[PDB]
C-alpha cells in the first residue's frame, strides 16, 4: 500500500495566508491588527522558546504581539491583577499564560481568570463546555487543527468509527468532542483500556496522542484508515518522530500525517486562526 | 437472570443521606441549604416543575424560595434577579425553568447563574470542568448513573462502555463521567454504522435515545451492565425503556428496570448537588 500524505505543513501555510489576507484587509479599512499577549513568570530556556515561537507566529501574519516577563517572586494577587488589565484592554484579542507557574500560585485560578473570549488556546472550562454542548466558541487548538486537516482533504466524517488513543485534557478529551460534533462514532482509549488493538483495528479514523515514539505499530491499523499522529517525540540524535511507526502504517492507511510536518504546524496555525476569530467575532466586529 | 439495579431504593438512600447531613448541620447551629427556583409565566408544565423541587426540598429539610414572574418581565429584570440570587449567601442553588418568553435570551440568562450555584450542572463552566477531570457541580442524570454503579460495587476501570445517544442532557456528559470513572468510552448516536457490533462488545451499556424497544435484548453482551435511561409511555399506559427488558435480562449481569431505575436518581442527585454546593463552596467549616 501507499497511503496519501496529510500535508499539514502545506495546509498550515494556506491557513496562515488566509489569516494574513484578512489582517491586510482590516488594515486597509482603518481597523487595528489583532493582538496577542503572552505572560511568563520567571524564565528559563524553554519558556523563552515558547515566547519566541508565539512572536514569530504573530509576525508571519501581521498580528501585534506583546510579552510580559514577570519576576519569579510575583504574587498570585499581582498576576490576577495583570490578567484583569489584559481582559479590559481592547487592543488585546488573545491571552496566553505560560505554564509552569511558580510553586505557591494557584495555576487554575489564574488561567480561569482569563476571559473566555480571549482564551485563544481554548482550555478555559467555559470554552471546553461550550464545545461539548455543541455551541463552540474558541476551541482547543490541536483538535480544531485536526478537524481543519480533515475538511481540507474533503474527508467525510459523518458515521466514521473514530478512535482516539490517549485521554489528555490538551488533546484526547476535546478531540472526542470535536469528532462527535463532526458526526463520528467516537471511542477514547487510555491507560486503563483493556486491549488497545481491538479498538484500533476497527477504526476508520485514528487519532494518536500518547507521546511515545513508535508506540502504535502498522499492523494494528485498519486497512484504509485515516491516521492522525499528534506525537512530536524528540530522540537522542535530535530527530523528531511520531507516536505511529510511519513506514508500517503507511502500508495500510489510506491517509497519514507525517511527523514532523503534519499536526504540528496546524496547532500553531489554529492558535493564529483563533486569535483572528476573537478579534473579528468577539471584540472588534 | 440479571440482578436488578434498584434505582428507587438507591435514590431513597441518597436523599436520606442528604437529609441526615442537614439534620447534623441544624444540630451544629448551621443554616439549611437553600434552593431558589425562577419561573416566568405559568403553565401546567412550569407549575409541576416548581412543585416538584419544593417537594424535594421539604423532604430533606432545605429552604426553598420560588419566584413566579409575570410574562411582562424583561430580560434585564430577570438578569438582575439572577445577580441578586448569585449574591445571596443563603442560596446555594439556582434553577431557571425553561421555556422563557420568546424575547428573552435563554443562554444569557442561564450562563449568568454562578457555576457554584448551578445545581443542574449544565452551565458550560461546569460541563467543561467535568471534561477536564476536575468536576464541580455535575449534570444530574449522568452523575446519578455513576452513583448507581458505585452503590452496586461495580468496578468501572477498564470496562468497555458504550453510550447510545449523544444528547446534551445525557449522552455527552455521560461520556465524560465514564472517562472520569476509567472506562473505555464509545459514544454512538444516530449516524453510527452497525450499532449491534458496538452493543455486542459493551461491558457497560447506557441507552438514552427515548425510543421504546430501540435495542433488542438479544444484542446485549453476556454479563453486561445495562443502564436504560428511556422512560417511554406507550398507548396502553405502560412505561417502558429503550432496551427490550425481558430479553436483555436473560443476558445481562445487572439491569435497571423501567420505571424505578435511572429516573429517581435524577432528582436525588439535584438535592445532593445542592448540599454539595452549600457544604463545599458556600458554607464550609
From Swiss-Prot, chain A:
Keywords per UniProt: Amino-acid biosynthesis, Histidine biosynthesis, Hydrolase, Methionine biosynthesis, Multifunctional enzyme, NADP, One-carbon metabolism, Oxidoreductase, Purine biosynthesis
Signal peptide: none
Metabolic or biological pathway, per its Swiss-Prot or TrEMBL entry: One-carbon metabolism; tetrahydrofolate interconversion
GO molecular function: methenyltetrahydrofolate cyclohydrolase activity; methylenetetrahydrofolate dehydrogenase (NADP+) activity; protein homodimerization activity
InterPro entries, per the entry: Aminoacid_DH-like_N_sf (IPR046346), NAD(P)-bd_dom_sf (IPR036291), THF_DH/CycHdrlase (IPR000672), THF_DH/CycHdrlase_cat_dom (IPR020630), THF_DH/CycHdrlase_CS (IPR020867), THF_DH/CycHdrlase_NAD-bd_dom (IPR020631)
Superkingdom of source: Bacteria
Pfam families: THF_DHG_CYH, THF_DHG_CYH_C
Gene Ontology BP annotations: L-histidine biosynthetic process; methionine biosynthetic process; purine nucleotide biosynthetic process; tetrahydrofolate interconversion
Binding locations of NADP(+): 166-168, 232
Keyword Nucleus: no
CDD domains assigned to the protein according to its UniProt record, in alphabetical order: NAD_bind_m-THF_DH_Cyclohyd
Catalytic activity entry: (6R)-5,10-methylene-5,6,7,8-tetrahydrofolate + NADP(+) = (6R)-5,10-methenyltetrahydrofolate + NADPH; (6R)-5,10-methenyltetrahydrofolate + H2O = (6R)-10-formyltetrahydrofolate + H(+)
This protein's GO CC annotations: cytosol
EC numbers: 1.5.1.5, 3.5.4.9
Gene3D superfamilies cross-referenced by the UniProt entry: Leucine Dehydrogenase, chain A, domain 1 (3.40.50.10860), NAD(P)-binding Rossmann-like Domain (3.40.50.720)
Subunit text: Homodimer.
Function: Catalyzes the oxidation of 5,10-methylenetetrahydrofolate to 5,10-methenyltetrahydrofolate and then the hydrolysis of 5,10-methenyltetrahydrofolate to 10-formyltetrahydrofolate. This enzyme is specific for NADP.
Family, as annotated: Belongs to the tetrahydrofolate dehydrogenase/cyclohydrolase family.
HAMAP family in the record: THF_DHG_CYH
Protein name: Bifunctional protein FolD
Source organism per UniProt: Escherichia coli (strain K12)
Phylogenetic classification of the source organism: Bacteria, Pseudomonadati, Pseudomonadota, Gammaproteobacteria, Enterobacterales
From Swiss-Prot, chain B:
Single Gene Ontology BP annotation: tetrahydrofolate interconversion
Record's subunit section: Homodimer.
Known EC number: 1.5.1.5, 3.5.4.9
Family matches, as CDD domains: NAD_bind_m-THF_DH_Cyclohyd (cd01080)
Binding site for NADP(+): 165-167, 231
Cellular component GO terms held in the UniProt record: cytosol
Catalytic activity: (6R)-5,10-methylene-5,6,7,8-tetrahydrofolate + NADP(+) = (6R)-5,10-methenyltetrahydrofolate + NADPH; (6R)-5,10-methenyltetrahydrofolate + H2O = (6R)-10-formyltetrahydrofolate + H(+)
Cytoplasm listed as a keyword: no
Role played: Catalyzes the oxidation of 5,10-methylenetetrahydrofolate to 5,10-methenyltetrahydrofolate and then the hydrolysis of 5,10-methenyltetrahydrofolate to 10-formyltetrahydrofolate. This enzyme is specific for NADP.
Name the UniProt record assigns to this protein: Bifunctional protein FolD
Family membership noted in the UniProt record: Belongs to the tetrahydrofolate dehydrogenase/cyclohydrolase family.
Family matches, as InterPro entries: Aminoacid_DH-like_N_sf, NAD(P)-bd_dom_sf, THF_DH/CycHdrlase, THF_DH/CycHdrlase_cat_dom, THF_DH/CycHdrlase_CS, THF_DH/CycHdrlase_NAD-bd_dom
Pathways per UniProt: One-carbon metabolism; tetrahydrofolate interconversion
Native organism: Escherichia coli (strain K12)
Record Pfam families: THF_DHG_CYH, THF_DHG_CYH_C
One Gene Ontology MF term: methylenetetrahydrofolate dehydrogenase (NADP+) activity
Gene3D superfamilies per UniProt: Leucine Dehydrogenase, chain A, domain 1 (3.40.50.10860), NAD(P)-binding Rossmann-like Domain (3.40.50.720)
DNA repair found in the keyword field: no
Gene that specifies this protein: folD
Keywords in alphabetical order: Amino-acid biosynthesis, Histidine biosynthesis, Hydrolase, Methionine biosynthesis, Multifunctional enzyme, NADP, One-carbon metabolism, Oxidoreductase, Purine biosynthesis
Amino acid at each position: 500500500g501507499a497511503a496519501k500524505i496529510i500535508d499539514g505543513k502545506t495546509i498550515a501555510q494556506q491557513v496562515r495566508s488566509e489569516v494574513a489576507q484578512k489582517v491586510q484587509a482590516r488594515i486597509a479599512a482603518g481597523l487595528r491588527a489583532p493582538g496577542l499577549a503572552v505572560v511568563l513568570v520567571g524564565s528559563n530556556p524553554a519558556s523563552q522558546i515558547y515566547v519566541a515561537s508565539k512572536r514569530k507566529a504573530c509576525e508571519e501574519v501581521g498580528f501585534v504581539s506583546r510579552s510580559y516577563d514577570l519576576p519569579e517572586t510575583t504574587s498570585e494577587a499581582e498576576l490576577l491583577e495583570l490578567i484583569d488589565t489584559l481582559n479590559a484592554d481592547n487592543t488585546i484579542d488573545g491571552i496566553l499564560v505560560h505554564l509552569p507557574l511558580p510553586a505557591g500560585i494557584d495555576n487554575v485560578k489564574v488561567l480561569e481568570r482569563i476571559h473566555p473570549d480571549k482564551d485563544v488556546d481554548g482550555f478555559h472550562p467555559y470554552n471546553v463546555g461550550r464545545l461539548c454542548q455543541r455551541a463552540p466558541r474558541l476551541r482547543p487548538c490541536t483538535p480544531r487543527g485536526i478537524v481543519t486537516l480533515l475538511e481540507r482533504y474533503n474527508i467525510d466524517t459523518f458515521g466514521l468509527n473514530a478512535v482516539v488513543i490517549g485521554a489528555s485534557n490538551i488533546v484526547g478529551r476535546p478531540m472526542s468532542m470535536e469528532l462527535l460534533l463532526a458526526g463520528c462514532t467516537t471511542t477514547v482509549t487510555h491507560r486503563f483500556t483493556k486491549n488497545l488493538r481491538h479498538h484500533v483495528e476497527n477504526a476508520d479514523l485514528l487519532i494518536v496522542a500518547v507521546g511515545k515514539p513508535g508506540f502504535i505499530p502498522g499492523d494494528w491499523i485498519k486497512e484504509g484508515a485515516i491516521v492522525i499522529d499528534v506525537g512530536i517525540n524528540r530522540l537522542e540524535n535530535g530527530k523528531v518522530v511520531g507516536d505511529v511507526v510511519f513506514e508500517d502504517a503507511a502500508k495500510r492507511a489510506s491517509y497519514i500525517t507525517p511527523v514532523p510536518g503534519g499536526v504540528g504546524p496546524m496547532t500553531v496555525a489554529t492558535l493564529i486562526e483563533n486569535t483572528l476569530q476573537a478579534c473579528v467575532e468577539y471584540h472588534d466586529p
